[PDB]
Design an enzyme around this catalytic site. Structure first.
Site, PDB file in Angstrom:
ATOM      1  N   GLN A   1      31.597 -16.291 -15.158  1.00 45.08           N
ATOM      2  CA  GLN A   1      30.706 -16.591 -13.934  1.00 45.08           C
ATOM      3  C   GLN A   1      29.722 -18.017 -13.781  1.00 45.08           C
ATOM      4  O   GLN A   1      29.772 -18.391 -11.913  1.00 45.08           O
ATOM      5  CB  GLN A   1      29.475 -15.942 -14.637  1.00 45.08           C
ATOM      6  CG  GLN A   1      28.376 -14.957 -13.670  1.00 45.08           C
ATOM      7  CD  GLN A   1      28.628 -14.777 -12.296  1.00 45.08           C
ATOM      8  OE1 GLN A   1      28.575 -13.395 -12.069  1.00 45.08           O
ATOM      9  NE2 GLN A   1      29.124 -15.395 -10.478  1.00 45.08           N
TER      10      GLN A   1
ATOM     11  N   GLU B   1      21.483  -8.128 -12.442  1.00 46.35           N
ATOM     12  CA  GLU B   1      22.676  -7.611 -11.976  1.00 46.35           C
ATOM     13  C   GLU B   1      23.286  -7.341 -12.527  1.00 46.35           C
ATOM     14  O   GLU B   1      23.979  -5.666 -12.412  1.00 46.35           O
ATOM     15  CB  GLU B   1      22.121  -8.208 -10.222  1.00 46.35           C
ATOM     16  CG  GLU B   1      20.962  -8.128  -9.250  1.00 46.35           C
ATOM     17  CD  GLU B   1      21.275  -8.378  -8.916  1.00 46.35           C
ATOM     18  OE1 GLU B   1      22.450  -9.167  -7.515  1.00 46.35           O
ATOM     19  OE2 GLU B   1      19.959  -8.257  -7.718  1.00 46.35           O
ATOM     20  N   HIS B   2      23.954  -8.081 -13.487  1.00 48.49           N
ATOM     21  CA  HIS B   2      24.950  -8.015 -13.958  1.00 48.49           C
ATOM     22  C   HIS B   2      25.006  -7.701 -15.390  1.00 48.49           C
ATOM     23  O   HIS B   2      24.385  -9.141 -16.129  1.00 48.49           O
ATOM     24  CB  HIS B   2      26.844  -8.706 -13.278  1.00 48.49           C
ATOM     25  CG  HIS B   2      26.628  -8.552 -11.861  1.00 48.49           C
ATOM     26  ND1 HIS B   2      25.618  -9.094 -11.596  1.00 48.49           N
ATOM     27  CD2 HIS B   2      27.806  -7.676 -11.421  1.00 48.49           C
ATOM     28  CE1 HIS B   2      26.622  -9.335  -9.704  1.00 48.49           C
ATOM     29  NE2 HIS B   2      27.586  -8.312  -9.965  1.00 48.49           N
TER      30      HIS B   2
ATOM     31  N   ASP C   1      34.549  -7.965 -10.585  1.00 48.37           N
ATOM     32  CA  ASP C   1      34.235  -8.812  -9.255  1.00 48.37           C
ATOM     33  C   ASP C   1      35.847  -8.720  -8.644  1.00 48.37           C
ATOM     34  O   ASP C   1      36.403  -9.292  -8.026  1.00 48.37           O
ATOM     35  CB  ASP C   1      34.711 -10.286  -9.929  1.00 48.37           C
ATOM     36  CG  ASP C   1      33.523 -11.107 -10.108  1.00 48.37           C
ATOM     37  OD1 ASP C   1      31.965 -10.559  -9.861  1.00 48.37           O
ATOM     38  OD2 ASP C   1      32.844 -12.221 -10.622  1.00 48.37           O
TER      39      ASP C   1
ATOM     40  N   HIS D   1       4.149  21.075  21.810  1.00 47.42           N
ATOM     41  CA  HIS D   1       4.241  21.676  20.631  1.00 47.42           C
ATOM     42  C   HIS D   1       4.408  22.682  20.624  1.00 47.42           C
ATOM     43  O   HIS D   1       5.744  23.356  20.813  1.00 47.42           O
ATOM     44  CB  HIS D   1       4.132  20.902  19.079  1.00 47.42           C
ATOM     45  CG  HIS D   1       4.979  19.295  19.127  1.00 47.42           C
ATOM     46  ND1 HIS D   1       3.749  18.246  20.011  1.00 47.42           N
ATOM     47  CD2 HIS D   1       5.941  19.213  18.341  1.00 47.42           C
ATOM     48  CE1 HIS D   1       5.002  17.019  19.426  1.00 47.42           C
ATOM     49  NE2 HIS D   1       5.794  17.392  18.753  1.00 47.42           N
TER      50      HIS D   1
END
Ligand SMILES: Nc1ncnc2c1ncn2[C@@H]1O[C@H](COP(=O)(O)OP(=O)(O)O)[C@@H](O)[C@H]1O
Lengths: 420, 438
Positions: B263, B331-332, B365, B424
């Site tokens: 990363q 998130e990861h 990835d 309606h």
């Protein structure tokens, strides 16, 4: 006076110009609404409950000493259920059973799948903790919208469904409150507009921060949802109230007039349009409009909507009717024609579709019942075996090394087994 | 001068604030990055192509006189395919095979169902007209992103898949363009940042307005995507580059250090954190980092990101490891532990999860989408509104028979009349049929 509906003709060389304008109506400018909504959001974040109370008094015409006077106990929803008629309650309960049964079958929870080489894939599925439901106040508020948002949230396992419903001048809709009771709404605040959306998105002292805001709403609600996206999940930005009727000329013109009125009566910025190749039919609908309008309880709202945004448009043939319809890209399309499945393929940009002469667009607002996914959070999971990491790693290794991402590559290579 | 990874310890009494600052510090403001974006969006909405070319010259440093020099022909994609090596082309083809197979199994189409009373219900499913794919420039651009987005769009039947990819100082990633050729991209514009997002969301003279914008992106692209929300469809907005590794100390420390490097090598702002109860292990990872870092090809970018946001974090036990993980809200998440399914119940704020010692977050990835399941025949069975559903529009249909209109009309009448919405009611009532009426 009698009312004369606007008339357009696509046989006019300048017809594209008027159609553009009809579709870009700035009653209150985007910019003015946008600044007002931005200011209210920032005001609710800064001052919390006090701001919510101040905006509720101003925009809902309500007296409220404090936020505690804007909290409806769930017991009030049970009272509402006792106050509506036998036939109203049965319609709501029947629709609820159908909505609830449907979503029970569709619900998907956590899962795992084991590949042949030992690798496990899947998803860990969790209900959202809280969800916020906007419910327009007063009479023009469909109970189906409560059922179809709150029931899948509760089926998903959302612990707290928070409903916000303004009470204009203190007016309450007992059918809507009864629907909220049947649908399992947990908490109710009598607040609306941008300040209700802001209070739900950011939280105040008394209004909880939710994980997703759902439901319909006029331009202030829609603009506020657009602006709190990112801070909170959002289902969608519903556009203005809208109907496009396409007719071949062989539907009763009173029916078509009333179908236009059905949307025009919701609010003053609703847009109702008719397109037809049949000139004599369009004249009949114009006469039906003129005659039927003063007989309508909501004639004032209907007239204002039709003056600002309504039209009957003449076209040459089925081909041009569909081209104009596709350009309008209506959220609701009523295909009042002999063979509707022959017209739909040329109108791919339409939203919900009501087909044939017997299907009033109004049925879509009062759906008697036949999602959960939209009230769940998902974590994707990959648990490679040694063999699975070798297969995946060989591909990743080549691609990463190709673009000099050598940490990516060696990371994957550490788990690659050598072949036999 | 061996590199000394930053060390933190949850037992410290300043830990909460020290970690808070590590997680939140920003180079340029939110308002300044967001302000620059709001300005760029208004500029290209106003000046169209000219603004795109101006922003491209300034921010990408390109000598492009007009919009026509920022258009890459489809042939240039085919030429990329011939420029990469054999092993790279086959790897792209293998990846594309797995993606395309999966999306074909998931694709759903229009349907109709006839109720007992003759009423027909169903859905009309059509592809979006145009989709726009954002692809980062340079070497830190995963070809996965091209394959994962362009292939479901083509499988859905999107007739025009438009790719934007900035080319800083003319640099071109041949593997990325080759991926685009394989994935069936139709047109490419060499533009990026907020101006690319705005050109796709609103359209200019040369860039077509698309129905949905997808893909990863830096802070300018992500901010621009947030602002054009409601104006054009978008996918999930990816957050900053980030990995949290949680380890029980039983993973090879070199594997762990390289997973952090994976990363860290993406960009200077990437955040790579390890959490562990095993103090001896953490020391071995610090040594692994010092020994392995010098000879990384992207050693300078890795060092920059680890210095600015990297950390090894000591905790008391598994429960505190999970509490820290929940506060970071990654998130990861790489759960590099013996029993990953036992740690997950206590992890409540995490996106995509890589489990066990054999799953490098790097595989995410290259073989999955962002928080997407890995595409296999088995995983295809589980439905998702991501994928082919992304690039389709669904229109519900109802075609009442005369009797169906009668049944539904009575219920519509009751509720609409109850609410005083009488247009309606009457609209529904017009279709109610009573056989005895002559
Ligand atoms: N300081 C900036 N101001 C405006 N735009 C910027 C700025 N820095 C980058 N950008 C935009 O972001 C793009 C960077 O290329 P991209 O590959 O998409 O992000 P990155 O390389 O960081 O991953 C540029 O095309 C540029 O338009």
């Amino acid at each position: 006076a009698p009312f004369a509906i606007r008339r357009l003709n696509a046989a006019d060389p300048d017809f594209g110009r008027h159609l553009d304008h009809l579709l870009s109506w700035e009653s209150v400018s985007d910019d003015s609404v946008n600044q007002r909504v931005l200011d209210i959001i920032a005001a609710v974040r800064s001052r919390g409950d006090a701001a919510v109370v101040e905006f509720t008094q101003r925009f809902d015409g309500l007296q409220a000493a404090s936020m505690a006077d804007l909290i409806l106990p769930r017991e009030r929803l049970e009272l509402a259920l006792t106050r509506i008629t036998v036939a109203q309650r049965e319609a709501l309960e029947v629709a609820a059973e159908r909505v609830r049964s449907y979503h029970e079958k569709q619900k998907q929870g956590s899962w795992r799948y084991t590949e042949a080489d030992g690798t496990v894939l899947g998803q860990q599925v969790t209900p959202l903790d809280r969800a916020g439901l906007y419910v327009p106040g007063g009479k023009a508020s469909y109970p189906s919208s409560v059922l179809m948002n709150a029931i899948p949230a509760k089926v998903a396992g959302v612990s707290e469904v928070v409903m916000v419903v303004p009470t204009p001048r203190g007016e309450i809709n007992e059918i809507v409150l009864a629907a909220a009771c049947i649908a399992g709404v947990d908490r109710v605040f009598t607040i609306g507009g941008a300040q209700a959306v802001a209070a739900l998105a950011y939280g105040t002292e008394s209004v909880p921060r939710v994980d997703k805001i759902v439901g319909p709403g006029n331009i202030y609600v829609a603009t506020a949802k657009r602006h709190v996206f990112g801070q909170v999940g959002i289902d969608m930005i519903a556009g203005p109230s809208e109907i496009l009727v396409v007719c071949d000329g062989q539907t009763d013109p009173d029916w078509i007039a009333m179908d236009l009125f059905s949307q025009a009566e919701h609010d003053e910025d609703a847009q109702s349009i008719l397109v037809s190749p049949d000139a004599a039919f369009l004249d009949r609908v114009a006469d039906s409009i003129a005659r039927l309008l003063p007989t309508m309880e909501r004639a004032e709202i209907i007239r204002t909507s039709l003056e600002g945004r309504g039209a009957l448009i003449q076209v040459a043939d089925q081909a041009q009717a569909c081209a104009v319809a596709n350009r309008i890209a209506p959220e609701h399309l009523e295909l009042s024609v002999a063979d509707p499945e022959s017209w739909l393929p040329e109108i791919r940009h339409a939203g919900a579709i009501f087909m044939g002469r017997y299907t009033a667009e109004a049925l879509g607002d009062y759906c008697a019942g036949p999602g959960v996914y939209d009230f769940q959070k998902r974590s994707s999971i990959i648990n490679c075996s040694a063999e699975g990491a070798s297969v995946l790693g060989r591909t990743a290794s080549v691609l990463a090394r190709g673009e000099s991402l050598t940490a990516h590559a060696r990371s994957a290579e550490y788990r690659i087994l050598d072949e036999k």
